[PDB]
Amino acid sequence: HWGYGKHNGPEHWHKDFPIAKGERQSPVDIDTHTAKYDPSLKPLSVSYDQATSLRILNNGHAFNVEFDDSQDKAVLKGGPLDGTYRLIQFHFHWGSLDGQGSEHTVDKKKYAAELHLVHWNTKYGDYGKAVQQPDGLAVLGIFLKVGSAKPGLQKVVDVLDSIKTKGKSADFTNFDPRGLLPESLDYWTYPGSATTPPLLECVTWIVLKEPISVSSEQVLKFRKLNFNGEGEPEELMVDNWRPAQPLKNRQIKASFK
Numbered sequence: 001h002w003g004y005g006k007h008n009g010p011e012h013w014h015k016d017f018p019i020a021k022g023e024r025q026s027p028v029d030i031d032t033h034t035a036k037y038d039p040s041l042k043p044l045s046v047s048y049d050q051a052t053s054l055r056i057l058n059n060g061h062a063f064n065v066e067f068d069d070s071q072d073k074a075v076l077k078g079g080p081l082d083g084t085y086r087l088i089q090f091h092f093h094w095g096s097l098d099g100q101g102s103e104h105t106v107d108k109k110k111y112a113a114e115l116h117l118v119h120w121n122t123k124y125g126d127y128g129k130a131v132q133q134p135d136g137l138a139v140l141g142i143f144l145k146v147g148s149a150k151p152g153l154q155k156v157v158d159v160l161d162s163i164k165t166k167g168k169s170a171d172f173t174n175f176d177p178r179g180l181l182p183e184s185l186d187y188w189t190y191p192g193s194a195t196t197p198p199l200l201e202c203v204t205w206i207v208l209k210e211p212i213s214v215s216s217e218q219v220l221k222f223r224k225l226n227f228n229g230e231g232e233p234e235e236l237m238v239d240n241w242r243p244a245q246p247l248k249n250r251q252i253k254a255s256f257k
């Protein structure tokens with residue numbers, strides 16, 4: 001199966017998921033000079049006041065914090081989006097060292113990590129139907145740089161010891177994802193894809209310009225997770241990021257001047 005090892009990493013994925021060479025793959029490099037301000041974009045509406053987290057899972061490629069998406073509670077609207085998108089999970093991608101880890105890049109700069117808050121379009125009724133549609137998902141991407149600690153992240157880092165290996169989960173209720181946002185909601189947006197197999201071309205990307213700061217100690221704890229299952233040879237969960245893909249016939253729009 002696919003992964004981020006020496007023999008099953010991103011350069012191999014196309015053999016089982018041919019869409020990997022498709023026309024709207026993600027992530028991409030964001031060339032800040034070429035991205036054009038679009039005055040027709042609206043402010044984002046991030047409405048997480050009623051978010052209900054449930055569980056955290058090590059799925060062998062990242063850890064997902066899962067939400068109750070059985071009704072509209074935590075939703076994303078506005079910006080480039082038509083309609084309402086429900087938060088289903090968030091996860092991160094990160095590096096073996098601070099100089100890499102993000103999936104999107106900004107003028108070729110790689111950040112230490114990248115947070116993805118994944119939302120599905122409620123007009124399709126369920127998540128599984130939404131991922132089959134070109135406007136089925138909206139992923140809010142947030143860069144992480146290493147500096148001061150992010151207080152709102154600490155509850156996540158502290159549970160990681162309990163989900164070290166693939167297939168382990170833990171209760172994770174009452175977590176407020178608003179504590180993972182930066183101050184500004186200025187963003188770039190473009191049409192793309194999921195960044196892990198099956199790489200479906202169903203995502204409207206909304207990538208925030210302002211990174212959040214996390215401490216070295218916080219990201220070091222991400223790097224103690226394992227890709228492998230319990231009792232298997234230890235493979236540290238690091239460098240679980242897909243590199244930038246060709247932009248092809250796409251424009252990246254900016255919400256800001």
Ligand SMILES: NS(=O)(=O)c1nc2ccccc2s1
Binds near residue numbers: 002012014
């Ligand atoms: N990256 S993938 O095409 O999905 C894939 N790579 C490999 C390598 C060895 C054994 C099975 C698979 S499946």
Ligand SMILES: NS(=O)(=O)c1nc2ccccc2s1
Binds near residue numbers: 195
């Ligand atoms: N990493 S991501 O683009 O946020 C993402 N990848 C996938 C793969 C399958 C289904 C949903 C998503 S959301």
Ligand SMILES: [Zn+2]
Binds near residue numbers: 092093195
């Ligand atoms: Zn992701």
